[PDB]
Design a protein around this ligand. Sequence first.
Ligand SMILES: N[C@@H](CCC(=O)N[C@@H](CS)C(=O)NCC(=O)O)C(=O)O
Length: 212
Amino acid sequence: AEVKLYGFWPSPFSHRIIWALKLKGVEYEYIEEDLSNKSESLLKYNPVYKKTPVLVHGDKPIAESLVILEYIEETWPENPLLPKDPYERAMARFWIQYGVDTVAALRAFYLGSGEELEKAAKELSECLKILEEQGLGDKKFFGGESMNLVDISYGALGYWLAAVEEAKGVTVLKPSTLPRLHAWAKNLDELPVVKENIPASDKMLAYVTAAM
Ligand SMILES: N[C@@H](CCC(=O)N[C@@H](CS)C(=O)NCC(=O)O)C(=O)O
């Protein structure tokens, strides 16, 4: 208790938060929101955006996943999910901001069909190549030898992108073209903190298919 999380079951934005709380050992009450029938609590706690997720700590709300993650890191500092050095912290924030570009590429892919899909797939691959070569490099995690907030932010490139790829019949994140990023996503997907806190594959595929 004392910590509440208003979430949406299939959303990586919500999953990210769960992962961070679990890595911090913070107990939370999870509240599932029906996005088509938003609770009064949700509208009250996030009047600007009226979206999930929303973390409430001591009756005070924090909205926007990226902001919530930073708040969790600063509020429960043990087991740091950001490094100490300002330059390395800036590189973490830089690659989290590149997540904006990645989300856009993922969106185009998710929405494409025909020639559009082919183009989107290609642009997503190019987006991920930059992330792999210049962000991840030869490190096991974006955080080096353990996960940091960048790993959390990109974790959806495993289970979630995999479900979208199955839905579209097109794989973008594949070992032959992105061997380091594919290995990273597979290793993250096998970590208990991730594996225990994502939806079952069938449910995840069923959701993204329906949405399409
Ligand atoms: N920028 C937000 C994005 C989260 C988001 O888009 N949430 C969606 C669900 S995945 C939502 O709640 N949409 C509200 C609606 O359908 O009106 C964040 O990172 O937290």
